[PDB]
Design a protein around this ligand. Structure first.
Ligand SMILES: *[C@@H]1O[C@H](CO)[C@@H](O[C@@H]2O[C@H](CO)[C@@H](O[C@@H]3O[C@H](CO)[C@@H](O)[C@H](O)[C@@H]3O)[C@H](O)[C@H]2NC(C)=O)[C@H](O)[C@H]1NC(C)=O
Ligand SMILES: *[C@@H]1O[C@H](CO)[C@@H](O[C@@H]2O[C@H](CO)[C@@H](O)[C@H](O)[C@H]2NC(C)=O)[C@H](O)[C@H]1NC(C)=O
Ligand SMILES: *[C@@H]1O[C@H](CO)[C@@H](O[C@@H]2O[C@H](CO)[C@@H](O)[C@H](O)[C@H]2NC(C)=O)[C@H](O)[C@H]1NC(C)=O
Ligand SMILES: *[C@@H]1O[C@H](CO)[C@@H](O[C@@H]2O[C@H](CO)[C@@H](O)[C@H](O)[C@H]2NC(C)=O)[C@H](O)[C@H]1NC(C)=O
Ligand SMILES: *[C@@H]1O[C@H](CO)[C@@H](O[C@@H]2O[C@H](CO)[C@@H](O)[C@H](O)[C@H]2NC(C)=O)[C@H](O)[C@H]1NC(C)=O
Ligand SMILES: *[C@@H]1O[C@H](CO)[C@@H](O)[C@H](O)[C@H]1NC(C)=O
Ligand SMILES: *[C@@H]1O[C@H](CO)[C@@H](O)[C@H](O)[C@H]1NC(C)=O
Ligand SMILES: *[C@@H]1O[C@H](CO)[C@@H](O)[C@H](O)[C@H]1NC(C)=O
Lengths: 99, 283
């Protein structure tokens, strides 16, 4: 390796990234992007696995330090903790009515 | 590096009928003032729980029982300590260098959590030294694993220094643990309840909260408890003898799939539970 060598004989540092998938749980993933919050609007949400549709507003309840989301007595998602602000946001179904 | 332990008279293992303890949070869902029915790996309200003793008599049984216990579907590990004798556990299948194993141990400075195919020993334990010169313990002789190779997971906590002195009196500390291994995830539940007892832990209820979730695709068949030993100038022994075990005792109960009726209060904390497999008036 001399500094006067042309293209072809110069040292080229090459790295190899080998991806392996086994029966073990997936530990390395891609960076999951995050969007801004919005209040008092009918908007679909997706925090961890919850794919619903409703209006997110500030709540007055307090979850446990490990409980992510909650649900009402009717087995329907009622509130969910924000994964970044650690705040509880109520989930209310959007306006459903007949004309 | 491993050193066996002699002068340990064998005693028939005792059993203690566990109370309603063992109930944990099966999921991370918030419920308030409702009675939810769950069908998961729970612990019955009354079952045989093996009682392991760790004491040191003044003469005419020295017990340091920490055998390799099986892991069928989940174990309920409750520790009634007074001087932090239990350091951790050793999970795995055969505890050999041919298959991977789980090592969870606290060496008084960090919470060492390594998942490698270690080469464990028959008597893995930690030791302290009651040095009268500087009035300090400064535990050493970390004898858990001999050869570590091909590690796939490692986790350490922030440096700290817990109390290592030998307290005299009753068990003023209760640590309950529930270990589960489903879908390749190793779920650990923990709960600390300050009590004051000497033996046969009192009846009560404590909902164990989820502590960590370590994703490790390994098979867990058996596990062993890592205890500690005390050594000082008044200890006859050079290599195998010359040690004493502080007053401590842990309980191990295996989980069974049953239906439990969880009672949540206005704050989302489980207050009571009903096992509808125990006796009449429960179903
Ligand atoms: C996840 O990231 C969010 C980023 O917004 C964290 O929320 C923010 O966390 C910081 C640090 O605890 C809070 O203090 C703030 O720090 C910044 C930078 O040092 C400082 O400029 C501010 O004046 C303030 O002191 C901050 O209040 C908090 N919220 C916002 C809106 O910034 C969140 O804590 C992170 N969560 C985890 C689990 O890491
Ligand atoms: C401790 O005692 C054991 C048995 O009394 C000795 O033999 C070991 O036994 C274990 C399990 O039975 C085996 O996994 C080891 O391979 C055995 N070792 C040998 C050298 O055969 C053991 O050697 C003793 N430990 C020491 C340090 O002497
Ligand atoms: C453990 O379960 C057994 C089930 O019968 C009970 O203890 C047994 O008691 C008989 C009667 O003396 C003995 O022959 C058995 O060896 C005992 N088994 C065990 C595992 O100890 C009892 O319900 C439970 N043990 C205790 C101490 O409550
Ligand atoms: C407790 O265990 C931890 C982890 O094994 C030790 O931390 C490592 O110690 C070695 C040897 O001193 C160092 O080379 C590493 O850099 C340490 N790693 C970290 C992340 O700190 C720790 O020293 C042990 N403590 C005692 C008292 O044995
Ligand atoms: C108390 O002081 C002693 C005196 O040196 C130290 O303990 C020894 O330190 C030397 C130096 O590394 C080594 O032989 C061992 O680490 C220790 N040996 C014994 C027999 O303890 C240390 O400064 C203090 N030890 C304790 C336990 O507090
Ligand atoms: C480490 O253990 C894993 C377990 O499946 C194995 O796939 C891998 O080849 C091992 N690596 C070695 C032995 O270098
Ligand atoms: C775990 O056990 C299953 C079946 O019991 C087997 O298919 C699998 O190969 C085992 N995994 C390891 C790492 O031993
Ligand atoms: C529930 O929380 C309230 C405050 O939010 C508190 O006053 C009350 O003592 C709590 N009850 C229990 C059983 O923890």
């Amino acid at each position: 390796f001399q500094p006067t060598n042309g293209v072809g004989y110069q040292p080229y540092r090459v790295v190899v990234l080998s991806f392996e998938l086994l029966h073990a749980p997936a530990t390395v993933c891609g960076p999951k992007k995050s969007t801004n919050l919005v209040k008092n609007k009918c908007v679909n949400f997706n925090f961890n696995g919850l794919t619903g549709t409703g209006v997110l507003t500030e709540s007055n309840k307090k979850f446990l330090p490990f409980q992510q989301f909650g649900r009402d007595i009717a087995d329907t998602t009622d509130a969910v903790r924000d994964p970044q602000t650690l705040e509880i946001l109520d989930i209310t179904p959007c306006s459903f009515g007949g004309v | 590096q491993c050193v066996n332990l002699t002068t340990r008279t064998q005693l028939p293992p005792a059993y203690t009928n566990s109370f309603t303890r063992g109930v944990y949070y099966p999921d991370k869902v918030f419920r308030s003032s409702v009675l939810h029915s769950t069908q998961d790996l729970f612990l019955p309200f009354f079952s045989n729980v093996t009682w392991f003793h760790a004491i040191h008599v003044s003469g005419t049984t020295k017990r340091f029982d920490n055998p390799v216990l099986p892991f069928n579907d989940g174990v309920y590990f409750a520790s009634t300590e007074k001087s932090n004798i239990i350091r951790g556990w050793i999970f795995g299948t055969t505890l050999d260098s041919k298959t991977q194993s789980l090592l969870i141990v606290n060496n008084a400075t960090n919470v060492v959590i390594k998942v490698c195919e270690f080469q464990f020993c028959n008597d893995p334990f930690l030791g302290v030294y009651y040095h009268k010169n500087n009035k300090s313990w400064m535990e050493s002789e970390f004898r858990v694993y001999s050869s570590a190779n091909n590690c796939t997971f490692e986790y350490v906590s922030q440096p700290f220094l817990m109390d290592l002195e030998g307290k005299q009196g009753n068990f003023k500390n209760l640590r309950e643990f529930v270990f589960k291994n489903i879908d390749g995830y190793f779920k650990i539940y923990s709960k600390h309840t300050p009590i004051n007892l000497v033996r046969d832990l009192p009846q009560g209820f404590s909902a164990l909260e989820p502590l960590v979730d370590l994703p490790i695709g390994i098979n867990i068949t058996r596990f062993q408890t890592l205890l500690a030993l005390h050594r000082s100038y008044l200890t006859p022994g050079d290599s195998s003898s010359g040690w004493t075990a502080g007053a401590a005792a842990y309980y191990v109960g295996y989980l069974q799939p049953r239906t439990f009726l969880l009672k949540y209060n206005e704050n989302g904390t489980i207050t009571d539970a009903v096992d509808c497999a125990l006796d009449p008036l429960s179903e």
